Short mmCIF file of C-alpha atoms in Angstrom, two decimals:
data_model
loop_
_atom_site.label_atom_id
_atom_site.label_comp_id
_atom_site.label_asym_id
_atom_site.label_seq_id
_atom_site.Cartn_x
_atom_site.Cartn_y
_atom_site.Cartn_z
CA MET A 1 104.55 110.56 123.28
CA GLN A 2 106.65 109.95 120.21
CA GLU A 3 105.90 107.52 117.38
CA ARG A 4 108.84 106.29 114.36
CA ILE A 5 107.40 106.90 111.11
CA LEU A 6 109.54 105.35 107.84
CA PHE A 7 109.49 107.74 104.26
CA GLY A 8 109.45 105.89 101.18
CA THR A 9 111.11 107.54 98.35
CA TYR A 10 112.06 108.05 94.67
CA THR A 11 115.52 108.75 94.47
CA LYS A 12 115.95 110.53 91.03
CA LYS A 13 116.64 114.16 92.50
CA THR A 14 117.96 114.30 95.76
CA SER A 15 116.68 111.65 98.17
CA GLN A 16 119.23 109.16 99.35
CA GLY A 17 116.44 106.18 100.33
CA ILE A 18 114.31 105.34 103.04
CA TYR A 19 113.97 107.99 105.82
CA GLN A 20 112.58 107.93 109.40
CA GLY A 21 110.93 110.67 111.44
CA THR A 22 109.27 111.44 114.44
CA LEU A 23 105.71 112.44 115.22
CA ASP A 24 105.60 113.83 118.87
CA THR A 25 101.80 113.50 120.16
CA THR A 26 101.96 116.32 123.14
CA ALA A 27 104.34 119.02 121.13
CA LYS A 28 102.01 118.53 117.89
CA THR A 29 105.03 118.12 115.84
CA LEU A 30 106.65 115.83 112.94
CA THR A 31 110.20 115.62 112.44
CA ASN A 32 112.65 113.97 109.44
CA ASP A 33 115.51 112.76 111.99
CA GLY A 34 117.81 111.83 108.66
CA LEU A 35 118.27 108.62 106.61
CA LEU A 36 117.91 104.96 107.72
CA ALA A 37 119.11 102.78 104.57
CA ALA A 38 120.77 104.32 101.31
CA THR A 39 118.89 102.58 98.30
CA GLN A 40 117.53 103.35 95.32
CA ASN A 41 113.82 104.35 94.48
CA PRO A 42 112.21 102.83 97.75
CA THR A 43 108.88 104.12 96.80
CA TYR A 44 106.60 101.87 98.76
CA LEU A 45 107.52 99.80 102.40
CA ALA A 46 106.20 96.71 104.26
CA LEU A 47 106.81 96.18 107.99
CA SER A 48 106.79 92.68 109.80
CA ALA A 49 106.03 91.81 113.26
CA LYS A 50 109.85 90.69 113.69
CA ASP A 51 110.60 94.55 112.68
CA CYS A 52 111.75 93.61 108.85
CA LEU A 53 111.44 96.09 106.72
CA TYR A 54 110.77 95.17 103.07
CA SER A 55 111.31 97.54 100.19
CA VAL A 56 110.60 98.65 96.68
CA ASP A 57 114.19 98.24 95.05
CA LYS A 58 115.93 99.54 91.89
CA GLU A 59 119.69 98.27 91.10
CA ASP A 60 120.54 99.33 87.81
CA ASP A 61 118.46 97.67 84.79
CA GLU A 62 117.43 95.29 87.46
CA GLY A 63 113.86 95.89 90.01
CA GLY A 64 112.47 94.03 93.05
CA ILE A 65 112.07 93.97 96.79
CA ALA A 66 114.81 94.61 98.85
CA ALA A 67 115.04 93.19 102.82
CA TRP A 68 116.14 94.85 105.56
CA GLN A 69 116.23 94.07 110.04
CA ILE A 70 115.86 96.83 111.90
CA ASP A 71 117.18 97.48 114.58
CA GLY A 72 116.87 100.52 116.76
CA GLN A 73 117.20 103.60 114.57
CA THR A 74 119.33 101.63 112.15
CA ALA A 75 119.18 99.15 109.04
CA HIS A 76 120.78 95.96 108.46
CA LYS A 77 120.28 94.62 104.84
CA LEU A 78 119.76 91.11 104.52
CA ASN A 79 119.82 90.59 100.92
CA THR A 80 117.50 91.27 97.59
CA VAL A 81 115.06 89.73 94.78
CA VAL A 82 115.82 91.15 91.66
CA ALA A 83 114.93 90.66 88.19
CA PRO A 84 115.86 92.42 84.72
CA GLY A 85 113.18 95.10 84.33
CA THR A 86 111.12 97.99 86.58
CA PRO A 87 110.85 97.85 90.22
CA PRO A 88 107.77 96.62 91.53
CA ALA A 89 105.23 99.76 92.93
CA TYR A 90 103.72 98.13 96.11
CA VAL A 91 104.94 95.25 99.11
CA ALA A 92 102.91 93.87 101.64
CA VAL A 93 103.70 91.06 104.44
CA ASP A 94 101.87 87.79 104.82
CA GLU A 95 102.54 86.94 108.73
CA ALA A 96 100.94 84.34 108.91
CA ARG A 97 101.70 82.52 105.73
CA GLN A 98 105.44 84.19 106.09
CA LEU A 99 105.34 85.58 102.60
CA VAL A 100 106.15 89.21 100.76
CA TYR A 101 103.53 90.33 97.99
CA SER A 102 104.79 92.65 95.58
CA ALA A 103 102.69 94.63 92.36
CA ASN A 104 104.96 95.37 89.29
CA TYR A 105 102.85 98.46 87.51
CA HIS A 106 105.61 97.96 83.96
CA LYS A 107 105.73 94.41 84.01
CA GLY A 108 101.66 93.67 84.67
CA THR A 109 102.85 90.93 87.35
CA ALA A 110 102.01 90.46 91.21
CA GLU A 111 105.22 88.33 92.84
CA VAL A 112 105.30 86.34 95.90
CA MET A 113 108.28 85.86 97.84
CA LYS A 114 108.77 83.55 101.02
CA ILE A 115 110.69 85.40 104.07
CA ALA A 116 113.54 82.86 105.71
CA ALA A 117 114.16 82.40 109.53
CA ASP A 118 116.35 85.60 109.23
CA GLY A 119 113.61 87.91 107.39
CA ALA A 120 115.61 87.07 103.79
CA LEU A 121 113.33 86.54 100.35
CA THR A 122 113.03 83.91 97.63
CA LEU A 123 111.20 84.60 94.84
CA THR A 124 108.48 81.60 94.71
CA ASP A 125 105.70 82.78 92.14
CA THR A 126 105.11 85.72 89.23
CA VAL A 127 101.72 86.02 87.91
CA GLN A 128 101.57 87.52 84.35
CA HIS A 129 98.11 89.61 83.38
CA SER A 130 97.31 90.81 80.17
CA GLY A 131 94.39 93.44 78.84
CA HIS A 132 94.26 97.42 78.76
CA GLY A 133 91.92 100.13 78.79
CA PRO A 134 90.51 103.45 76.96
CA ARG A 135 92.39 105.76 78.46
CA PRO A 136 96.32 106.89 77.95
CA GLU A 137 98.17 105.71 80.79
CA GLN A 138 95.93 101.51 80.22
CA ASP A 139 98.39 100.94 77.43
CA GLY A 140 98.52 97.09 78.84
CA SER A 141 98.20 95.34 82.48
CA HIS A 142 99.34 97.50 85.38
CA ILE A 143 99.06 95.81 88.89
CA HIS A 144 99.45 98.54 91.90
CA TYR A 145 98.51 96.39 94.65
CA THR A 146 98.67 93.05 96.22
CA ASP A 147 97.30 92.19 99.63
CA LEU A 148 95.42 90.30 101.57
CA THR A 149 91.51 90.13 101.96
CA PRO A 150 89.64 89.52 105.55
CA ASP A 151 89.47 85.76 104.98
CA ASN A 152 93.46 85.92 103.49
CA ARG A 153 92.61 85.48 100.01
CA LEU A 154 94.85 88.17 98.17
CA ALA A 155 93.15 90.81 96.44
CA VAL A 156 95.39 92.19 93.04
CA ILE A 157 94.48 95.00 91.15
CA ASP A 158 95.17 96.03 87.68
CA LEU A 159 94.75 99.96 86.77
CA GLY A 160 95.42 99.06 83.33
CA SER A 161 92.73 96.28 82.37
CA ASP A 162 90.45 97.94 85.18
CA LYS A 163 90.11 94.56 87.27
CA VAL A 164 90.26 93.35 90.46
CA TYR A 165 91.50 89.71 90.86
CA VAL A 166 91.35 87.95 93.88
CA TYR A 167 93.72 84.99 94.37
CA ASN A 168 93.72 81.94 96.28
CA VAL A 169 97.43 81.56 97.91
CA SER A 170 98.87 78.04 98.61
CA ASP A 171 101.41 78.03 102.08
CA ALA A 172 104.17 77.27 98.88
CA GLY A 173 103.68 80.83 97.66
CA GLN A 174 101.51 80.47 94.53
CA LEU A 175 98.77 82.36 93.37
CA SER A 176 95.57 80.54 91.87
CA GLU A 177 92.39 82.77 90.68
CA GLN A 178 89.60 83.05 92.84
CA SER A 179 87.32 85.91 91.29
CA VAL A 180 87.61 89.06 88.95
CA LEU A 181 85.78 92.28 89.16
CA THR A 182 85.85 94.16 85.93
CA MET A 183 85.14 98.12 86.81
CA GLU A 184 83.47 100.41 84.28
CA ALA A 185 85.92 101.23 81.28
CA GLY A 186 88.42 103.79 82.47
CA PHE A 187 87.79 103.39 86.19
CA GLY A 188 91.68 103.19 86.79
CA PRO A 189 91.51 101.05 90.44
CA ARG A 190 94.37 101.40 92.39
CA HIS A 191 94.40 100.44 95.50
CA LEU A 192 91.81 99.11 98.21
CA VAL A 193 91.12 98.98 101.83
CA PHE A 194 88.73 96.39 103.93
CA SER A 195 86.13 97.62 106.85
CA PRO A 196 87.44 95.91 110.22
CA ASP A 197 84.17 93.46 109.89
CA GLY A 198 85.42 92.65 106.05
CA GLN A 199 82.35 93.00 104.96
CA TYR A 200 82.82 95.89 102.43
CA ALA A 201 85.89 97.14 100.78
CA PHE A 202 86.66 100.95 99.26
CA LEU A 203 88.16 100.75 96.16
CA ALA A 204 90.14 104.28 94.87
CA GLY A 205 89.78 105.04 90.99
CA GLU A 206 93.32 106.76 90.24
CA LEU A 207 91.93 107.65 86.34
CA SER A 208 88.57 108.84 87.09
CA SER A 209 88.88 110.43 90.50
CA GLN A 210 86.10 107.82 91.74
CA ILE A 211 85.85 105.75 95.00
CA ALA A 212 83.75 102.32 94.44
CA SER A 213 82.39 100.90 97.56
CA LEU A 214 82.35 96.99 97.31
CA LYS A 215 80.65 94.12 99.13
CA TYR A 216 82.74 91.44 99.85
CA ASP A 217 81.86 88.04 100.29
CA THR A 218 83.65 85.53 102.27
CA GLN A 219 82.43 82.17 100.95
CA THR A 220 82.67 83.40 97.28
CA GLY A 221 85.67 85.29 97.43
CA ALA A 222 84.03 87.66 95.27
CA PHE A 223 82.69 91.20 95.34
CA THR A 224 79.86 93.50 94.31
CA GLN A 225 79.88 97.15 93.42
CA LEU A 226 77.63 98.76 95.46
CA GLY A 227 77.96 102.83 94.48
CA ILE A 228 80.53 105.68 93.28
CA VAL A 229 81.39 108.72 94.47
CA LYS A 230 83.73 111.26 93.27
CA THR A 231 86.96 112.44 94.88
CA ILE A 232 87.25 115.71 94.06
CA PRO A 233 84.49 118.96 92.85
CA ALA A 234 82.43 118.20 90.13
CA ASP A 235 83.67 120.93 87.85
CA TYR A 236 87.40 120.67 88.89
CA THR A 237 88.34 119.18 84.97
CA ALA A 238 92.11 120.00 85.58
CA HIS A 239 94.66 116.69 85.88
CA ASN A 240 94.06 114.52 88.85
CA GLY A 241 94.86 111.17 90.09
CA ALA A 242 93.61 109.36 93.47
CA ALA A 243 96.28 107.75 95.29
CA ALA A 244 96.26 106.28 98.50
CA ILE A 245 93.13 105.16 100.68
CA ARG A 246 92.62 104.60 104.57
CA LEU A 247 90.37 103.59 106.69
CA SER A 248 89.65 104.30 110.36
CA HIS A 249 90.22 101.49 112.98
CA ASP A 250 86.51 102.30 114.12
CA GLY A 251 85.71 102.03 110.00
CA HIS A 252 83.50 105.14 110.45
CA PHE A 253 85.86 107.27 107.97
CA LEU A 254 87.38 107.20 104.91
CA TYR A 255 90.54 108.98 103.45
CA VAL A 256 91.70 108.97 100.05
CA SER A 257 94.53 111.41 98.61
CA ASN A 258 94.14 113.37 94.98
CA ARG A 259 97.48 114.22 93.08
CA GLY A 260 96.58 117.38 91.04
CA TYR A 261 93.63 118.92 93.26
CA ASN A 262 96.35 117.93 95.89
CA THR A 263 93.78 117.59 99.08
CA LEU A 264 92.72 114.56 101.27
CA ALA A 265 89.22 114.21 100.93
CA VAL A 266 87.42 112.70 104.06
CA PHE A 267 84.00 110.19 103.80
CA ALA A 268 81.72 109.37 106.71
CA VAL A 269 81.18 105.86 106.22
CA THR A 270 77.40 104.88 106.84
CA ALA A 271 74.77 101.80 106.14
CA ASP A 272 75.61 99.44 103.94
CA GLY A 273 78.69 100.44 102.78
CA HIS A 274 77.53 104.37 101.51
CA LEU A 275 79.99 107.27 101.53
CA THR A 276 79.11 110.65 101.86
CA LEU A 277 82.01 113.58 101.57
CA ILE A 278 82.47 115.62 105.01
CA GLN A 279 85.91 117.35 103.73
CA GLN A 280 88.60 118.44 101.29
CA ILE A 281 91.78 119.51 103.09
CA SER A 282 94.86 120.90 101.27
CA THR A 283 98.10 118.86 101.58
CA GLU A 284 100.41 121.37 101.36
CA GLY A 285 102.25 120.33 98.75
CA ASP A 286 101.87 119.20 95.31
CA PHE A 287 101.20 115.40 94.25
CA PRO A 288 100.37 113.95 97.59
CA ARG A 289 100.90 109.58 96.98
CA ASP A 290 100.51 108.63 100.40
CA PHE A 291 99.61 109.40 104.20
CA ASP A 292 98.05 107.43 106.85
CA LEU A 293 96.90 108.17 110.37
CA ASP A 294 99.14 107.44 113.24
CA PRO A 295 98.82 104.63 115.71
CA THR A 296 96.56 106.75 117.85
CA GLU A 297 94.65 107.87 114.86
CA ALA A 298 94.38 111.26 116.51
CA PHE A 299 97.15 112.20 113.22
CA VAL A 300 97.23 112.09 109.57
CA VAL A 301 100.42 112.41 107.98
CA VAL A 302 100.74 112.99 104.13
CA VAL A 303 103.90 113.41 101.78
CA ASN A 304 104.18 115.38 98.78
CA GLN A 305 106.17 114.00 96.08
CA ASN A 306 106.85 116.61 94.36
CA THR A 307 107.31 119.67 96.37
CA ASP A 308 109.72 117.40 99.02
CA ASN A 309 107.44 118.28 101.95
CA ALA A 310 105.52 116.22 104.76
CA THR A 311 102.19 117.64 106.54
CA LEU A 312 101.01 117.00 109.82
CA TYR A 313 97.43 117.39 110.78
CA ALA A 314 95.17 116.57 114.52
CA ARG A 315 92.16 114.13 113.74
CA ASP A 316 89.40 114.44 115.89
CA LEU A 317 88.71 111.03 117.22
CA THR A 318 84.64 111.38 116.54
CA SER A 319 84.00 113.77 113.96
CA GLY A 320 87.10 112.39 111.60
CA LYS A 321 87.76 115.76 110.29
CA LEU A 322 91.32 117.13 109.99
CA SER A 323 93.07 120.48 110.74
CA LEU A 324 96.18 121.64 109.89
CA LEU A 325 99.59 121.54 112.52
CA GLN A 326 102.47 121.78 110.93
CA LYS A 327 103.67 121.64 107.32
CA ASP A 328 106.55 121.92 105.34
CA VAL A 329 109.10 119.43 107.21
CA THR A 330 111.40 118.06 104.52
CA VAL A 331 111.41 114.60 103.05
CA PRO A 332 112.84 114.50 99.72
CA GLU A 333 110.53 112.87 96.84
CA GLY A 334 108.57 111.15 99.59
CA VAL A 335 105.99 108.68 98.33
CA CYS A 336 105.06 106.32 101.15
CA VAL A 337 104.31 106.67 104.62
CA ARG A 338 105.08 103.74 106.91
CA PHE A 339 104.39 104.29 111.05
CA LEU A 340 106.01 101.56 113.17
CA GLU A 341 102.92 100.07 114.90
#
């Protein structure tokens, strides 16, 4: 069958915006069919059930989120919500509340926007954080993730201050703190993903190349750190920044991308959130900032930021391991993989 994929990118060299491709499950191929939307620095993407696309957006010295309505193999711009400063780094959709969340790295903010009847957005709240860390990259607050918890609270990750916040969300679109988990100094938390039963969360530590297993309690809206594992060899001393983290639908396998060592590390999830490294596979390019399993979960697509190429893997449904199928599919400055679902 044919599965549509959207690619987010940086537009500092040759990219013209958001691209789209197709994953052919039978032929075992991956293509970049072309540009879907001409826009600047759409480094992260989010989709709604009404097929509206929300992307990181840069409009000169202003940055924010752009809203588009997808119609077939085309995209129609609805509107944008921008403000003086840098563009955000993450964006997500809250279907039930009809809100869009975004995280801004440089500003250290978490923002909330409400979705109008036609998909257009309106800013409702901007939460400012503060703090810092021991590492050079932690000069100030750097929010890198804003997404829903199993009980619909909002998990907000601050890479700059080594903290994972949990916020309650109002219907009107405002956040109010519930809890804050502080990680060991220098951990540099970036993204996380919850288990299918909502009892556990796996947090990627970008700066320390580690993954923390966490127990989540819906009653307290808080976390408890369970254990930590490395995402690269113990002797690899060169630069490495973990990036994206994904979990299979059955919750049995965890995946994380490594920028520097340039691989996808596969972990088997066992009792009480424990992780076991079972595979390290090259992404066939430099700096794999994002990747994801396809809807059937029989494949994985990763994009490499610095080499402008995407790679397709076959994924064993029972073992969770990956094997190369195709490499060097051109996607300029690719940094986000968004399958239609």
